[PDB]
Structure 1
Amino acid sequence: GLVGKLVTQLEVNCDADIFYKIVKHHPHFFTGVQVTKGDGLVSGCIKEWNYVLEGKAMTAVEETTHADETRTLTHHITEGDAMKDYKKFDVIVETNPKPNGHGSVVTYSIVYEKINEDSPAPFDYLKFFHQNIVDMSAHICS
């Protein structure tokens, strides 16, 4: 099966709307541009990343869009090392209140389509994104 999705979901002790605003505004570096929607206000960005994953230097080009009303960030990868393995690679970050009312659930989903049946599934990316949100979440408190 070539099409799949990997998910990591974590509970965080933080209001969903604030946490989303934190995530939205944030060896590696990027160059790139911001994207606007017509009113001159930034609606997203396009970045070329240089990063190291499990010791190997890689590049990617990522177009990011946000949806404030659903607290969703979407990172659409168009180019780079990952596209040697995947025809499609998108990363969707959602933040929602726990039905308990107070804290939040953060979901990172990697939606992918492999080039062929010999391509890996992106467990190395899932672990990276997971640890990154754990790390960010451990620099926040009430």
Structure 2
Amino acid sequence: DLSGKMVKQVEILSDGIVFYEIFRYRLYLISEMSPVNIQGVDLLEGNWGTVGSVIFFKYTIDGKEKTAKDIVEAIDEETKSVTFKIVEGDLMELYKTFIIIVQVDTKGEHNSVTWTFHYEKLKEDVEEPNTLMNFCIEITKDIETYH
């Protein structure tokens, strides 16, 4: 009832493996590649690119500054998939739980990035995270055009 599901897949003209490795290993590169959207990525715990690593994001949605604390819950090297779990931040004001999965198709001539949100809302009249999805899409376009 309160749980929901959001998926968006976009093609990328950039290299799919590079794109995947950024989200696994090199989140820190994101803030230079999309400075409007993300001001900073801090590794709070663990090593970059491992399940259990904990991370702090400073970002801006609709020109309003926000922060998130994520744990990497799963990684699958075969499908090139990284799962992030939000445990603190502004989104936890609206949603009880929120998961984000980035999964990158690389084996084919056309490469794509798929984004999947799995969430549970605190109340029925909480909005769908469309603003969060467009934002992930903007980021993907920036990484893609960075070269």
- Aligned 8 A contact 2:85 2:99 in 1: yes
Report what 1:68 is aligned to: 77
Question: Are 1:29 and 2:29 counterparts?
Answer: no
Q: Which runs of 5+ in 2 are unaligned?
A: 28-37
Report what 1:54 is aligned to: 62
**1:14-36 CA distance string (max 9 Å, x none):** 45434322443245224333425
TM-score by length of 1: 0.80
Report what 1:111 is aligned to: 118
Question: Are 1:133 and 2:144 counterparts?
Answer: no
The structure number with the bigger radius of gyration is 1
Instruction: Quote the Cα distance in structure 2 between the aligned partners of 1:42 and 1:133.
Output: 18
Report the AA paired with residue 43 of structure 2: G
Report the AA paired with residue 33 of structure 1: L
**How far off is 1:58 after superposition?**
1.9
- Aligned 8 A contact 1:14 1:102 in 2: no
- Aligned 8 A contact 1:15 1:102 in 2: no
* Aligned partner (choices 123, 129, 141) of residue 122 of structure 1: 129
TM-score by length of 2: 0.78
**How far off is 1:42 after superposition?**
5.3
* Higher share in strand: 1
**1:35-72 CA distance string (max 9 Å, x none):** 25xxxx95142112232211222221111243222200
**How many pairs are equivalent?**
134
- Aligned 8 A contact 1:96 1:105 in 2: yes
Report the AA paired with residue 42 of structure 2: T
**How far off is 1:130 after superposition?**
0.6
Q: Which runs of 5+ in 1 are unaligned?
A: none
Instruction: Quote the Cα distance in structure 1 between the aligned partners of 2:75 and 2:11.
Output: 21
Cα RMSD between the aligned structures?
2.2
